[PDB]
Amino acid sequence: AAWNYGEVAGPPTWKGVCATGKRQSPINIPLNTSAPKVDAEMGEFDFAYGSFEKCDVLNTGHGTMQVNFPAGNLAFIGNMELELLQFHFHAPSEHAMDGRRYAMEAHLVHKNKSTGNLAVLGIMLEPGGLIKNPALSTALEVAPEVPLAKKPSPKGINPVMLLPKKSKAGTRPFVHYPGSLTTPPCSEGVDWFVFMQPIKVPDSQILDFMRFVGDNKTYATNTRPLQLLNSRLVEYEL
Amino acid sequence: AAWNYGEVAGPPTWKGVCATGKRQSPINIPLNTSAPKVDAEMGEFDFAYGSFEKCDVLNTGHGTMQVNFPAGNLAFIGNMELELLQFHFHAPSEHAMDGRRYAMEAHLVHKNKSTGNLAVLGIMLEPGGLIKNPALSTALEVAPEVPLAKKPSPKGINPVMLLPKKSKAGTRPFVHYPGSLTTPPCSEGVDWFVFMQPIKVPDSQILDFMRFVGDNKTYATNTRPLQLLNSRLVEYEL
Ligand SMILES: O=P([O-])(O)O
Ligand SMILES: O=P([O-])(O)O
Ligand SMILES: O=P([O-])(O)O
Ligand SMILES: O=P([O-])(O)O
Ligand SMILES: O=P([O-])(O)O
Ligand SMILES: O=P([O-])(O)O
Ligand SMILES: [Zn+2]
Ligand SMILES: [Zn+2]
């Protein structure tokens, strides 16, 4: 009949810009579309991330844990310098590609040192991996139980492990578009770069994360529904 | 302000008995409780599932697939004859054990020949299994992806495979309680038997099922919240 489970009741009740905004994330990312793809002409990312950062792991109390970093983790793109602030995860992925979401999505949030605005790199996490992603692994182990608490992690964290390998041609193809934080206050003016290439994590880790989101008592999600592109352009650095 | 993702939005708005009835499923099943427990004194289940070749797999448009059986598969418990009509699944589990849901719950739905009620057997699926479960596997393989569509299974689907292994005393401990269907119209007078011993399953299959629940484009759940026990008691045949 006309009964369903439906989507989580949360997001559609969010107020503020979350409802009125016209530049909201996440959005769909067409990549097998018939429409012309506007090249972002921005170059390739160059990453200067540390290999054993010492991090605070916060429990955001909204599902994901948040691994915070000290300065000196820099990513370079389009003549700007982005500094890494923190990473966290969402399951399922928040962006889709051609309408389809992935098992998880890592978000690596940066400050644009050039501008002061927020930049966010999104990486899709796919099931099927056989090597435990140590960044995600450490972030699940150190994650404090009490919401809004934060323990320092004993192990180091290499955030490079949440980025795609360079392809056979040396690229890390991506798409770029202006958007917003995916959680309240859903603030706009955020620059989004989303990597086309997923990383393969093991299925155990994805379930571990959904378990974390469900507070070790069930399996839950923490993703916002797709938003309307509106008059925005997605730019492709393939 | 405060905000969350929440749970799915559909269930709390299901109407009719879903809302008014006082014998609804699922429920939390205490086990590590001081409280004394009423023994079911019903003996152990015996299974005579035979006519499992040539059965249909149906996509219900409500998340799970449903493996329909022909007449002739019987289960016996107490003085009672349970005729298997179909099985399907939920992720995460619908019933909880001390407030803990498992990754999946299998529901084998029978007609109780002896009372003219339905009877539902309920098995928890945990991750961490080394062998694909064959019933769940074929269910996933054969299940048509188009909603409302059904397809005959080429291979035979042995429903016994969804039952936990006998304990080191020859038994499969379970709890019994009168409840309802977990989906609308939530009709009451369903006999629930929930087994206490989960079956371990490869994480691949759990994500594959959550994938199926998500129209093969996301990962989603299909579970109703827990329901008040009210006047009932839970019978334990441990
Ligand atoms: O440091 P990368 O950007 O060459 O990996
Ligand atoms: O920035 P490079 O040294 O990884 O090419
Ligand atoms: O990609 P899978 O086979 O781990 O589900
Ligand atoms: O950084 P997010 O949580 O707003 O996506
Ligand atoms: O393989 P497990 O650790 O997810 O059970
Ligand atoms: O068999 P159920 O899922 O309607 O309880
Ligand atoms: Zn995020
Ligand atoms: Zn069910």
Side-chain angles (χ1 to χ4, degrees), chain A residues 5-6 9-10 101 211 217, chain B residues 5 7-8 10 101 211 217:
Chain A
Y5 295 99
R101 288 182 153 164
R211 191 74 177 173
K217 294 199 194 308
Chain B
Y5 293 96
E7 293 177 350
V8 286
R101 295 191 146 161
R211 187 71 179 190
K217 54 142 174 170

Side-chain angles (χ1 to χ4, degrees), chain A residues 126-129 201-203, chain B residues 203-205 207-208:
Chain A
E126 239 186 14
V201 143
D203 307 44
Chain B
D203 312 40
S204 87
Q205 264 175 332
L207 286 185
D208 289 338

Side-chain angles (χ1 to χ4, degrees), chain A residues 3-11 14 62 92 100-103 127 183-184 203-204 207 210-211 217-219 222-223, chain B residues 3-11 14 62 92 99-103 127 183-184 203-204 207 210-211 217-219 222-223:
Chain A
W3 74 265
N4 64 16
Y5 295 99
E7 300 317 316
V8 294
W14 291 344
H62 299 120
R100 320 196 143 194
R101 288 182 153 164
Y102 285 78
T183 68
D203 307 44
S204 71
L207 291 184
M210 290 175 173
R211 191 74 177 173
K217 294 199 194 308
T218 185
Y219 292 83
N222 70 325
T223 271
Chain B
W3 68 272
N4 59 278
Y5 293 96
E7 293 177 350
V8 286
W14 294 347
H62 295 125
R100 287 191 156 92
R101 295 191 146 161
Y102 283 68
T183 62
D203 312 40
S204 87
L207 286 185
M210 291 179 71
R211 187 71 179 190
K217 54 142 174 170
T218 197
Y219 297 86
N222 61 328
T223 283

Side-chain angles (χ1 to χ4, degrees), chain B residues 91-166:
Chain B
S93 65
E94 219 139 30
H95 291 88
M97 314 229 197
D98 300 328
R100 287 191 156 92
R101 295 191 146 161
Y102 283 68
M104 283 175 59
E105 180 176 329
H107 284 169
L108 284 51
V109 182
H110 303 77
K111 189 166 78 166
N112 193 344
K113 298 286 220 186
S114 310
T115 69
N117 282 345
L118 284 182
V120 186
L121 309 204
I123 307 100
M124 304 311 195
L125 276 46
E126 273 179 331
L130 297 164
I131 276 191
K132 294 221 301 169
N133 186 286
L136 176 52
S137 195
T138 305
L140 291 161
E141 173 196 359
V142 182
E145 295 292 311
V146 194
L148 279 37
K150 56 194 290 180
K151 186 202 294 152
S153 175
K155 305 184 287 157
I157 302 176
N158 184 25
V160 191
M161 291 297 101
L162 302 172
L163 274 295
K165 299 306 168 192
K166 289 175 165 180

